[PDB]
Amino acid sequence: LCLSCRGGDYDCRVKGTCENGKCVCGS
Numbered sequence: 001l002c003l004s005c006r007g008g009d010y011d012c013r014v015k016g017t018c019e020n021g022k023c024v025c026g027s
Contacts, residue, residue, distance in 0.1 A: 001016070001018065002014075004021075005019070005020075005021045006021060007023020007025065008023065011025075013025070
């Protein structure tokens with residue numbers, strides 16, 4: 001889950017990992 005970071009679509013921000021201000025919804 002990404003809150004204090006920028007990322008793609010909401011769905012991507014939910015299942016994404018929040019790292020270094022960036023949301024990563026992948027592997």
